[PDB]
């Protein structure tokens, strides 16, 4: 407090004899008064130091900062100016003089002169762009010319996302340079860091309208009007994606009703040009965004029945699936990934996965939708829910559409497997999109195509890394990214389960649409993913490379289950299970051995943690964890039997996949699970396939028949245990009927071997 | 004809295969490898000039090539320090709202100065640089001094 | 910095005012390096890498 | 180059250039049309060029 600074300065001015030695402590005395907010006592003690040390730039800078905290602009500037005179290395203080002059007087030739000096010390600086902008808007018509040349010449360096591109388009539109405004949009839209802004897309959509509102009946304009409507419908579809994701329900209505109005003006152009092609695809995006708006209404509308919103949303996704994918001929020169192919695959992925999240666990569900709503009553119920009955249906795209020519076909999973491989190109490997697809596939019995997606996004990586107890970015493989995404999906799925453990409805989807599903992954999971992407694709900005490396080198300890990893036991089981089920699902010894190798790595990290819980000890949680612990999956004291069975089964599977067959047989015959019996049957059937039947000895033929007998007599045990206990069928990795398909074969393979 | 003018003919590929190994996110690793390439050829040329009979006028180019690549080596060393500091400072300057302690010693005023002051920090990187040149000219020799 | 921040007491001798009163800049050092009588330094301060070293330091 | 050699009465040098053009090339110029968002013949410089190479062969 003041009184402690006063007591210290009293005893320190007692322990000082001469006046000049008291002044020589004045800098120190002044800082202590400033740290009590005693600003005039700070001023009084720094001036009584300066009057004994006229040439310290730090004492002058401290007196300037005290005048800045007294709003005394030119005295702050004069003490800063004097500090620049006494040490010219202070580039920062040259810029701080330009701040406090342009914030005092915009006409001041000193403001313009100190900005001149700041620019000549920091080119490419948004703080210096902003201090020029503030002078040149005040230089009038003579200002406007200089402001145009400034905007062009400092855009050409790429600071400043969003702002300067909107301010340029304002200045074109106010001067009625409308084709110049649209031509700037035609260049600026090539920047992905503008296409992500709601503000930019709002300006683009409104600039394209104001240009159409200036075109005429001329045969030039019959081409300009085509481009500008293709641009306008694509800009509406991206603005609608952003508005669904970032704004309210009513903000989403008024935009969708504006997009409906812009489809209705193009709808007359029955033809075969790229506006005819864009219009067809944009019917698909309109109904996808309308189905997204109905489920976004359900997310907030506390008094509304989820059936009516999800029925009208299922109709919307059925239309948004059945809109045919563009039949492009992409040409042998154009390295441009076609936008209509990527947007059609993102549509067919999102509408297809949303149909399967709404039909889930029902019968005739898409037929409830078609027989009730694929008609002009359903067309009204859809319009009167989306827009309300305040506008005409005759003047609307939706209100005058067809929705009667509809198919009843559910989305085929191999078609989705090919549309995700387009959607992930549109989303550039975004973790929110990869987690969203992961949760849709985690609603099905088949595994997500993560290996397809990762070898598409990171094709310069090895699949495994022979250095698992290391954390360097130079040792990353696909399996660290596969494990990472499996953990982001798992921790997102449990944080959906535990929301649905309240008031969930059979007409509410378990996963909401991508433009409606709030953030799934943590900013730490994302900060690792975005840093991995930025390092591998070498987008790493200078200096920041070191921060990105240190962050990436933090979570590789976590992911590979290294020293003090802090993971939940059930997440390490889920990683072992998913890699085991993926490894055996591949026609490749090298892939099997890498996948099952990484599964066995996690099982050999699980067995120690189980041997904490089997004593009724807890495990230490991280205060911030990369993957959350969840008490709705914390391992119970009984399950520590099965998580000590399946671990050794997975060792015997890896060691069979090593060629360690007699170790693996000994392991399986010691474990005596039905999963062990199935791997014994496969090992002994393979030991009849590895006998080349072109004139064998009777000794080789009788060991072959003894392998077929060992196979038969282990396939039988799987029937014995399964009709003795109908739970055992749920550890079996195949249909019980395919145990009988193989057993019938292995009996024919023994009885045909007996008529000679 | 000079050996030095024949021996340094690789460095135009060697710098290229070093550039095509790196990126804008490994742009200092590139200059540290450029110093290792120049320092390797300075080592080779020194291991030729130290074997020339004094006054054999052919080795004039070998000695000029040694000094040229020795001054190049330390100019890559200079670049690898000063442009690292200047990029780190330009990424930290939004953050450092420091406060001095009432009870600080000379050491901890200077521990604060070398954070506060890029002119003092870059001036010491020139001292460290110039002291490293004199160090590399001393090498193994300290224990060969008869008194 | 030390004699601005570390308030010593009862010390009655000065460090020389030619060194305490020294204004420094990087440009100045590379003018003083061109005012020197040492002819060697004046010839080395004209060769290609010593010129690059001045400009990289600035 | 064949137009230059034929006008220069260098019929064998024109035949040396005719052998530098591989005999698949007329069909390869159609292969490069049908895959990728072109027309039914390869463009109007190249239809005329195939017609000209067929004149030179004749």
Swiss-Prot record, chain A:
<feature type="repeat" description="TPR 3">
    <location>
        <begin position="91"/>
        <end position="125"/>
    </location>
</feature>
<feature type="modified residue" description="Phosphothreonine">
    <location>
        <position position="16"/>
    </location>
</feature>
<feature type="repeat" description="TPR 6">
    <location>
        <begin position="580"/>
        <end position="613"/>
    </location>
</feature>
<feature type="repeat" description="TPR 5">
    <location>
        <begin position="284"/>
        <end position="316"/>
    </location>
</feature>
<feature type="repeat" description="TPR 4">
    <location>
        <begin position="162"/>
        <end position="198"/>
    </location>
</feature>
<feature type="repeat" description="TPR 2">
    <location>
        <begin position="57"/>
        <end position="90"/>
    </location>
</feature>
<comment type="subunit">
    <text>Part of the nuclear pore complex. Forms a complex with NXT1, NXF1 and RANGAP1. Forms a tight complex with RANBP1 and UBE2I. Interacts with SUMO1 but not SUMO2. Interacts with PRKN. Interacts with sumoylated RANGAP1. Interacts with CDCA8. Interacts with PML (isoform PML-4). Interacts with BICD2. Interacts with MCM3AP isoform GANP. Interacts with COX11. Interacts with synaptic plasticity regulator PANTS.</text>
</comment>
<feature type="modified residue" description="Phosphoserine">
    <location>
        <position position="18"/>
    </location>
</feature>
<feature type="repeat" description="TPR 1">
    <location>
        <begin position="23"/>
        <end position="56"/>
    </location>
</feature>
<comment type="similarity">
    <text>Belongs to the RanBP2 E3 ligase family.</text>
</comment>
<comment type="subunit">
    <text>(Microbial infection) Interacts with HIV-1 Vpu protein; this interaction allows Vpu to down-regulate BLM sumoylation.</text>
</comment>
<comment type="function">
    <text>E3 SUMO-protein ligase which facilitates SUMO1 and SUMO2 conjugation by UBE2I. Involved in transport factor (Ran-GTP, karyopherin)-mediated protein import via the F-G repeat-containing domain which acts as a docking site for substrates. Binds single-stranded RNA (in vitro). May bind DNA. Component of the nuclear export pathway. Specific docking site for the nuclear export factor exportin-1. Inhibits EIF4E-dependent mRNA export. Sumoylates PML at 'Lys-490' which is essential for the proper assembly of PML-NB.</text>
</comment>
<protein>
    <recommendedName>
        <fullName>E3 SUMO-protein ligase RanBP2</fullName>
    </recommendedName>
</protein>
<feature type="repeat" description="TPR 7">
    <location>
        <begin position="645"/>
        <end position="678"/>
    </location>
</feature>
From Swiss-Prot, chain C:
<comment type="subunit">
    <text>Part of the nuclear pore complex (NPC). Forms part of the Nup160 subcomplex in the nuclear pore which is composed of NUP160, NUP133, NUP107 and Nup96; this complex plays a role in RNA export and in tethering Nup98 and NUP153 to the nucleus. Does not interact with TPR. Interacts with ZNF106.</text>
</comment>
<comment type="similarity">
    <text>Belongs to the nucleoporin Nup84/Nup107 family.</text>
</comment>
<comment type="function">
    <text>Plays a role in the nuclear pore complex (NPC) assembly and/or maintenance. Required for the assembly of peripheral proteins into the NPC. May anchor NUP62 to the NPC. Involved in nephrogenesis.</text>
</comment>
<protein>
    <recommendedName>
        <fullName>Nuclear pore complex protein Nup107</fullName>
    </recommendedName>
</protein>
């Amino acid at each position: 407090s003041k009184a402690d600074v006063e007591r210290y300065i009293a005893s320190v001015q007692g322990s000082t004899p001469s006046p000049r030695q008291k002044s020589m402590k004045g800098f120190y005395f002044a800082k202590l008064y400033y740290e009590a907010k005693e600003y005039d006592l700070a001023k009084k003690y720094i001036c009584t130091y300066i009057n004994v040390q006229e040439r310290d730039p730090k004492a002058h800078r401290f007196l300037g900062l005290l005048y800045e905290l007294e709003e005394n602009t030119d005295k702050a500037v004069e003490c800063y100016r004097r500090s620049v005179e006494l040490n010219p290395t202070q580039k920062d203080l040259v810029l701080k003089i330009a701040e406090l002059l342009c914030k005092n007087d915009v006409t001041d030739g000193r403001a313009k002169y100190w900005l001149e000096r700041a620019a000549k010390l920091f080119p490419g600086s948004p703080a210096i762009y902003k201090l020029k902008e503030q002078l040149l808007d005040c230089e009038g018509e003579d200002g406007w010319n200089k402001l145009f040349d400034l905007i062009q010449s400092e855009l050409y360096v790429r600071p400043d996302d969003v702002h300067v591109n909107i301010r340029l388009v304002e200045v074109y539109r106010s001067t009625k340079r409308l084709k110049d405004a649209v031509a700037h949009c035609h260049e600026a839209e090539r920047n992905i860091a503008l296409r992500s802004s709601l503000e930019w897309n709002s300006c683009v959509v409104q600039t394209l309208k104001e240009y159409l509102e200036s075109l005429q009946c001329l045969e030039s304009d019959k081409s300009d009007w085509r481009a500008t409507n293709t641009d306008l419908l694509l800009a509406y579809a991206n603005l609608m994606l952003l508005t669904l994701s970032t704004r309210d329900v009513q903000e989403s209505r008024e935009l969708l009703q504006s997009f409906d109005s812009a489809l209705q003006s193009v709808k007359s152009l029955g033809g075969n040009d790229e506006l005819s092609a864009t219009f067809l695809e944009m019917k698909g995006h309109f109904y996808m965004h309308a189905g997204s708006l109905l489920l976004k209404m359900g997310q907030h509308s506390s008094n509304v029945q989820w059936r009516a919103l999800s029925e009208l949303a299922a109709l919307c996704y059925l239309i948004a699936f059945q809109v045919p994918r563009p039949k492009i001929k992409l040409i042998k020169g154009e390295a441009g990934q076609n936008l209509l192919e990527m947007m059609a695959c993102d549509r067919l992925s999102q509408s297809g996965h949303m149909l399967l999240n709404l039909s889930r666990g029902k019968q005739d569900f898409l037929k409830e939708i078609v027989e009730t709503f694929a008609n002009k009553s359903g067309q009204s119920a859809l319009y009167d829910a989306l827009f309300s009955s305040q506008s005409p249906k005759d003047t609307s795209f939706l209100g005058s559409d067809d929705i009667g020519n509809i198919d009843v076909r559910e989305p085929e999973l191999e078609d989705l497997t090919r549309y995700d491989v387009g959607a992930i190109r549109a989303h550039n490997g975004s973790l929110q999109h990869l987690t969203w697809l992961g949760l849709q596939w985690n609603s099905l019995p088949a595994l997500p195509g993560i290996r397809k997606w990762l070898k598409q996004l990171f094709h310069h990586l090895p699949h495994e890394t022979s250095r698992l107890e290391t954390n360097a970015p130079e040792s990353i493989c696909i399996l660290d990214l596969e494990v990472f995404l499996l953990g982001v999906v798992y921790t997102s799925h449990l944080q959906l389960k535990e929301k649905c453990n309240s008031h969930h409805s059979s007409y509410q989807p378990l996963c909401l649409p991508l433009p409606v599903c709030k953030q799934l992954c943590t900013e730490r999971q994302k900060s690792w993913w975005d840093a991995v992407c930025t390092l591998i694709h070498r987008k790493a900005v200078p200096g920041n490379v070191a921060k990105l490396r240190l962050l990436v080198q933090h979570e590789i300890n976590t992911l590979r289950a290294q020293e003090k990893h802090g993971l939940q036991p059930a997440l390490l089981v889920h990683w072992a299970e998913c890699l085991q089920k993926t490894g055996s699902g591949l026609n490749s010894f090298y892939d099997q051995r890498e996948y099952i190798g990484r599964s066995v790595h996690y099982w050999k990290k699980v067995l120690p943690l189980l041997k904490i819980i089997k004593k009724k000890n807890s495990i230490p949680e991280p205060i911030d964890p990369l993957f959350k612990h969840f008490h709705s999956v914390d391992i119970q004291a009984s399950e520590i039997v099965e998580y000590e069975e399946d671990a050794h089964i997975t060792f015997a599977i890896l060691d069979a996949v090593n060629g360690n067959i007699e170790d693996a047989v000994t392991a399986f015959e010691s474990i005596k699970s039905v999963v062990s019996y199935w791997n014994l049957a496969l090992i002994f059937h393979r030991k009849a396939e590895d006998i080349e039947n072109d004139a064998l000895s009777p000794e080789e033929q009788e060991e072959c028949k003894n392998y077929l007998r060992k196979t038969r007599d282990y396939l039988i045990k799987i029937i014995d245990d399964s009709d003795s206990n109908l739970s055992v069928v749920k550890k079996l990795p195949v249909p019980l009927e395919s145990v009988k398909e193989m057993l019938n074969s292995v009996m024919q393979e023994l009885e045909d071997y007996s008529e000679g | 004809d000079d050996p030095g003018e024949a021996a340094s003919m690789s460095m135009f590929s060697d710098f290229l295969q070093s550039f095509l190994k790196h990126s804008s996110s490994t742009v200092f690793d590139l200059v540290e490898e450029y110093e290792n390439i120049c320092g390797s050829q300075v080592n080779i040329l020194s291991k030729i000039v130290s074997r020339a009979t004094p006054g054999l006028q052919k080795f004039s180019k070998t000695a000029s090539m040694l000094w040229l690549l020795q001054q190049e080596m330390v100019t890559w060393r200079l670049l690898a320090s000063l442009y690292r500091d200047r990029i780190q400072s330009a990424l930290e300057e939004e953050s450092v709202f420091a406060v001095t302690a009432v009870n600080a010693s000379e050491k901890t005023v200077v521990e604060a100065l070398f954070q506060r002051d890029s002119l003092v920090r870059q001036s010491q990187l020139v001292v460290d640089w110039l002291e490293s040149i004199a160090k590399d000219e001393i090498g193994e020799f300290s224990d060969n001094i008869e008194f | 910095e030390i004699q601005t921040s570390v308030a010593t007491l009862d010390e009655t001798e000065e460090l020389p005012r030619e060194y305490l009163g020294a204004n420094w800049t990087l440009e100045k050092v590379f003018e003083e390096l061109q005012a020197t009588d040492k002819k060697r330094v004046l010839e080395e301060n004209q060769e290609h890498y010593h010129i690059v070293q001045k400009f990289l330091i600035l | 180059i064949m137009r230059k050699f034929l006008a220069s009465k260098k019929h064998e040098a024109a035949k040396e250039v005719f052998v530098k053009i591989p005999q698949d090339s007329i069909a390869e110029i159609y292969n490069q049309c049908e895959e990728q968002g072109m027309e039914s013949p390869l463009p109007a410089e190249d239809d005329n060029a195939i017609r000209e190479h067929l004149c030179i062969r004749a």
